[PDB]
Amino acid sequence: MVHYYRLSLKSRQKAPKIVNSKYNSILNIALKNFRLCKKHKTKKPVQILALLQEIIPKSYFGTTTNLKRFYKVVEKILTQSSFECIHLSVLHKCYDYDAIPWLQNVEPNLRPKLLLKHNLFLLDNIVKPIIAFYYKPIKTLNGHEIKFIRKEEYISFESKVFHKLKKMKYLVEVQDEVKPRGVLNIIPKQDNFRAIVSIFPDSARKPFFKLLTSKIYKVLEEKYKTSGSLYTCWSEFTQKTQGQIYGIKVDIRDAYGNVKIPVLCKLIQSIPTHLLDSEKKNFIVDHISNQFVAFRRKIYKWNHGLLQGDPLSGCLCELYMAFMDRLYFSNLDKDAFIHRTVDDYFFCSPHPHKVYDFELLIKGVYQVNPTKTRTNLPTHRHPQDEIPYCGKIFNLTTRQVRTLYKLPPNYEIRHKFKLWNFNNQISDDNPARFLQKAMDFPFICNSFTKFEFNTVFNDQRTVFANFYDAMICVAYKFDAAMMALRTSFLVNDFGFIWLVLSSTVRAYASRAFKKIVTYKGGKYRKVTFQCLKSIAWRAFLAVLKRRTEIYKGLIDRIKSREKLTMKFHDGEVDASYFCKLPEKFRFVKINRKASI
Template sequence: MITMTYFRRTQRTQTTINEYFSLEPINENRKRKMRGLSLKQQFGSEECTEKYKILQDILKKSKDFVKDNPHTQNVNFIFMALDQIISDKYFGSKSNRKIFYCTVKKIIRRSRFECIYRRELYQGYDYTCMTWLTREQDFVVVNEWVLNRIVKPIINKYFFAMKDINTNYGLKLIPMRKWFSFQTRVIQNMIKNQHLQPLSCNPTCIRGKLSILMKKDINNVESYRPIVLLNKNSRGSESRKKLKEIAASIRKLASEMCDTKTKYFYQEWSKFVEETGYKNIYGAVADVKDAFGSITTKKMSNLLDKLVEEKNMESAKGYYIKAHIRNQNVIYQFTRKGIPHIGRWKHGLLQGDILSSALCQLYISDLDRQYLTGFSQNFLLHRSTDDYFFCTTNREDLTKFMAIMKKHYKINVNKFQSSIINDNILLYNGNIFIMGSKEIKCHYKFKKGSLMKHKCKFWNLRNQ
């Protein structure tokens, strides 16, 4: 998931942006710590002071504003809201308000892993304008409380934060109304295409909550990735441990089934280059389209039965896996009253499940065992989940590989690459492979105009 720091308290204590924007599950203790103390808990001993009354007024206006303004369209709405919620008495001057808004802008525009310092909360302010402030050193505590109890709830109420697909570390704030509309349209589309089957009765076994990730554009309902967020109750259970053990055994079996390498790519590449010497090499890269979705329950069950017959798998384990993939029940939506809508996932393997990735590898390895054979000795065949990299010194082998992939695999034509067609250059695993010189270069691809801080990781939180 996304990790990025919005706020640094001390040299080693920080609060992450994914928590600030509610991008990942947080335990209750952490939630309380992140939310901060309530007004009474924080400033209860100062109830009669002007400071307490100002903060009480800000809190009341915040609640009223949320009730009166259910929707928003853009990020500037946050500052319009703060204009109405935080009174001039709090800041004392326009310049102080401007400094505070600059801090809010930094929070909104941060990239993942980037930090802002605690000094942002007190440096540059004119304290003489704040008649309610008795001690200057108290202002940083009050300002932090306003950020945690006023600004953060507004951002989480009106916006959904997600990774910007055009950059490595950028974040994008999408109005919550648009995000809910996108999710609803995607769910309707999944039900229409029979990828998801709504259930009238509540099953005993529910895998988790179905999360929908946008891949390209929010207006494109075909561009999404469904991933299940597993139930918290099952994270430390015995069944989870058992599933992890089964997944490990499946991956081991998948790696032994065929000649396709699935680990240590750069070691394999170096070994291949060393063995080929000065010979010309030819290569191709292929991407299997919708790898998880194309593996139906029936196909997987037939493969498991075949492996049991070949004595490559115990019958009890095969039966357990089949029972597991038949019951891919998920919560896909909630009503306004919080009642869950439960459905059964019918479009292949459910991404995010403990066994899905291992079973996908097993199924594709079985295809490799059947079709990707008969090449000469000098070749390298590597697969990273559903991406293939093939290299050989024999041009006929390359032609054969391309023909097999197009005939027996459902490949993404737009992502298919060949060194013959693509000027001896291949893109794989985030790198550029130059077949002529056998060099490897990092592949940087960013949208024009992207900020440098969204392209690279400048902060290492472990060492700060």
């Protein structure tokens, strides 16, 4: 029932000095050379795919081919995404079982499962462990992307930051033998840093912290106002506002850290006993003012707002932010547009001076990241009609809204996906069910919301563009899943693609249609089903042309068996946008390769 092998570096085991009788004696030599490699180590740069060559003797694989078949799995671990795994079958399938010495006087039928048991050993005892020995995995937060930084370079950074936390008195040394509550790490967010703690933890406080987290979220929806509906706010604003819309999007800096601990406590107190009694009066208040952390075998005290990674910080921030929000954000123009989230405000107005002033107030009440501030004020140096907010792009002039796709240059588009699910594992002999799950709706469901397919304020062309761009994402995952099929599944007969892909195209054009209808508007003209369908096909072709040598057959089938020509019943819609890969997606990498 279990076919997946997690590429995650978190499965590595403490390698033994020698293997027992269940393993061939070859592995002993390997384990031995391994121990030697962990000593010759120098701060000098190494490549895991080269040390293993010194560790696992070639006498193990027999022929270069078998050696290469395996070291591919290593490269997968070296260039993995969070949640990625392969089929255990790939560890024993195809291998030239004759060229393998230690498996000769072993019955030809018992060989598959034996090689599996061994390749796994190496992977879990040497390969993964030596990777983690030199490097440190870091989740970049931009999807399931993972970067491997040399432990030396990471530690050096961790220190630079650690001392900064000392001098700025965000940490203070103590002497207690207990109460750390957790250990703090330093994740290199972009180019700044983010200091976070980790609960030890204990299950004797977890169903308790849940009741608290939930109870505080209740105080929010019962005592404090909501930001309202983004779709509604932007709808009504554009409906009534006829002049030039002016707006600013500000990003609050260190929301968790800029919390005034003294005040948040007094906020927890004033909470009506209806919800939360004298238990919060002390505990939640106590927890906040007493956030101790364990670092380098020393327990420093954090006194800079709330700590990230603390089970309480999540809700307490939303309570403190909604409190502040209520203090200095009451008297905003009632005819103006306002919208807040985690740490992002979005103020619009036909009167620029009011937008101008909102920023001043917002910079007075909070601290902001100016580099992430987006506006169209003349007073700013980089005006833009298009400001990003809540995964959508609002054009202050055309009033149009498009999905926000965070795709940095050179970013590997595959990471954006979670093709492998460890709870619902798909056997290697069934590629159809795998390709299907990949082509589901759940993931791109965000690009299929009112914001994209509404016709109240969005032009006919914008809706078609929103669909095309979202289908490109799908199309990009199709290629991403197709790679997995020929690497893990080891598919040779590529024919079932047509059944899934054709169903995928039709299914989505329908998803669009129904959505375009549910949110029709005065900007509507006519969205013919066959048109939506064409865009979907136009999308797959755009992403597919990136591997003309691989998808040659698939492309031709689309160009001949499908009517790609779409009939926009609307005139003000440039159709040439669907005849090429959108520039937004023109910079993603679709070519994997190990480097570390």
